[model samples]
Every structure is written in structure tokens, then in C-alpha cells.
Target: SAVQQKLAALEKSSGGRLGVALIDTADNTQVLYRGDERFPMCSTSKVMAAAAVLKQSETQKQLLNQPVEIKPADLVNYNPIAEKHVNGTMTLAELSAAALQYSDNTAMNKLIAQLGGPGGVTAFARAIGDETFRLDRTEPTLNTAIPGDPRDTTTPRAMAQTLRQLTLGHALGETQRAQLVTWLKGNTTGAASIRAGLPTSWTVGDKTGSGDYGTTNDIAVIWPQGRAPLVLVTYFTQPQQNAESRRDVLASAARIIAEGL
Candidate 1:
């Protein structure tokens, strides 16, 4: 009730639409605000791509550590890693690490192609019981797409559920599951948004997304002291193009959940 009211207050001042799903996996308690609406996921969709790549690595007998080739022609902007290195090869594991930790656009495009394009990532989501997510483009393409267009859309509930399952090792073998979490936990790109909202004492393994306009999102498994962790997903979008405003919105939401829980 208090949390709902707080979020509603945020929505009023947010100048945008906001959705949240907070699930306490410890006992299955949950709270949702506009949870059913499909919202753009942006780079947050990388987690889905990560799952597909891990699965493919298993089926194709490809070692994650083995080096793979990616043409510079395939690279796009927003790639901090690629921005530094003019031309070079990165291992599948290194690419994955870059994709998660830095949200590397070039690395993601490579992973998407390896998984058979947008259709491949979508198929993996559905097979794992994630019916609402749609993957239809690569980084700069999806990045610069009209904000909130829902090209790469999913509900807050669906994303949280997917992350929760990943945490619990559902739909993945031990090594594969651990691999995904390790990369996610290594995410160095999410200093703002949800991570900023959280207490310094807490640890959050999360993925964040933003664009020129359209979306700001964070999907995270939170570890609070003295209790089991919870999965929290927040998405915000509006005609306004202020990303910092949306980041504050996410931080405020995280505070509400962390304090209330």
C-alpha cells in the first residue's frame, strides 16, 4: 500500500509510464504495478541473448573460452570495448563478459547472429516460458529505434520471472546457470539506476538499459542482509527524453522495495 502510493507519486512526477515487478522468491510474495503492459527492454534484453548463447554453446560443443572472430564491419557504436580496440578478436567468453559488464553493442550483435538472429533469441525465451518478450533487432538498430516502440518488448513480470528462474538454475544446467550469473554479477555498466538506489551494504546483480528516448530499465536479483534475495524489475518510459530523470525514478523505486522488504 505505501509502496504503491509511493510509486504512484513517482508516476505523477515521472512524466512517463512506469512498471514494476518485485518478487520475493523466498516465499513467493510479490507486488506489481502496471505489470502486464509490454515495455521496451533495450540493453536489458542482453540477458535473454546471454541465455541463448549459453544454450547454443552447449549444443554446438563450443568452448566459451575459445576465441571467435567478429568483423569490425559488424560492430556498432555504444561499444566501449570496441571503441578502445580498433581491430582485434575476442573469445566467446570475452565477448560475453564485455556484453554484460560494458553493454557492448558490437559484442551483442555478434552474439545475436550466433544465436540465429532475433528469431533465435525469441524462441529461447518462449521455450523457457517467457512468452511476452520479443527480440527483433540488434544494438544500434534497437538502441535508436523509436523509444517505447515495443520492438523489443516484455512485461516487468516476465523479465523478473525469467531472471528468477535463471537464479534458481531452472532451464539451465549447473555450469550454464553459473556462467550467466557470474557475467551478470560482473556487470560494471549499472552504476546508476537500480544500483544507485540500493544501500551500499547490499549487493545487486543486475542488468540496465537506456536509450536516447523511450526506456530506462533494470532487472536485478537483490541480496539484502539477514534475508533471502528477491528479484526486482523496473521499466520507465515517456515522451520525455531525460534519462537521468528516469534513473532517479528507478532509484526511488528500489529504495521503496528495499526499505519495505
Candidate 2:
């Protein structure tokens, strides 16, 4: 119950609303505080979703912006381009980029569909060491796509393992990995969490996931020359996990710690 105790302390520190993880790449270590529970990764699911796309591609890539229409049956409130432009069809590449780069739900779901649905995604999950992860599309919002088993979800160390593969060229190829690095280098979502935790100069390759009902997570890879990469994953959740200040503090801690690695 020490894990739970740590989470309790983090919740108190954050004024409640905590579920996150910190993973280090060099030694593959982790520092977790606050809510370690599994709330749906929300847009955070796109990290793996993107991986699925790359895995299915010819050279571990996607089919960018090519007029892929948004069918009404597949629409939801979280879809930006698809909802606004249902009649239009964009490339699989655009949707994938939107999903991760912008956390676009419609784009992500569409990309999932294009990549052969949950089964394909499941295969990708297996490739990266998540053998039992599942993607349930039976929901209509961003806060419901849970990876791993249905009973719970991913933890910091496990997510770190996934990142390690991505960095080590195991899940996807070098070219695809390069693409992810390029995209992650300029991520803008979830600023108050992992992105805000580190210094201004170091390059960070990461993805952050969140929800309204207390779910916020980040899995990251930090580059420090002459040292092994730093990988960190954090998830925060509560019945109503909206403590922005606490999230900022956690992210700051993650970044500061990575700066030393």
C-alpha cells in the first residue's frame, strides 16, 4: 500500500487529483507519485495509436492527407477536422498527425479504422511489449480509449519499456522512429504536465494523455548527449482530477530530474 500512500501524498500535494508516473531511460527506472490508477488515456491513447499506424505502413509510416472522408456514423464531439468537414477525406497521415500532434479524436479513430481496427492495434501493442492491451471504440468521447487490460491500464514502468523500444528501434524502424522524434520534438498539448517539467534547451520526445474526470499522463524521452536517454511516464487521475497547479509541479519535477540524467 506504499504506492497508494505515495499517491495519497501526491493528491494532498496537488490538492487532490493525481495519477502520474516518471520513467528513466538510462537505467530503466521510475519515480511514481500520486494517482497511479488507470483512467482512460484520452488522447494519450494516440501514442500507441500512432505506433499502430506506423507499424502498418509500408516502411513503418502513414499515408498522409489524401481525402479520407468522415462518415457521419463515425463522428463524435471530440473530432475536429472530421466533424467540421464530414464530407471531406484527409490522408491517413494527416489524421495520425492530428491525433498525436493535436490529439484529434476523430483523426485518431479514423486512423485506427484505416489501419484495420483494434486487432491491428492489438498486434502493435504486442510488438511493443503490451500483449493484452485493447482499444474499445464503443465509446463516444476522448476520455475512454484505455490501453492494456479492461480491468485497469498502463503503469509508469511499463510505459517506459514501450518508450525504450521506440528509442532503441525495436517497435518501429529508424525512419519511422525519426518521424516520431520529429513530431514529438514540437508537441504542444498537455503543457502543464510533462512538457512543463523540464528545461528549455533539452529536446523532449513525448506524449501526454488526459481526461476531464481526473486522467492525465505523459510518457517521454529526453536527449542528453554522452548519457543514455531519459524516459519518463506519468499518469494522474481522480474523480475530478483537474488540479492544474499540481500537474505543473509534477511536470517540473520530471523535467528537472531528467535534466540531470
Off by over 4 Å in 2: 1-9, 15-21, 32-39, 59-67, 71-73, 83-85, 142-152, 241-246, 253-256
Over the stretch 48-139, how does candidate 2's per-residue lDDT look in tens digits? 77777776664533355356887887776666656666776777767777777766777777777776775666567776777534566522
Model 1 stretches with alpha carbons more than 4 Å out = 145-148, 241-245
Model 1 Cα lDDT, one tens digit per residue, 144-251:
436547788899999989889877646877788888888887889777888888888877889988865657888898878887888999988877555443688899
User: What overall lDDT goes with each candidate model?
Assistant: 0.82, 0.62
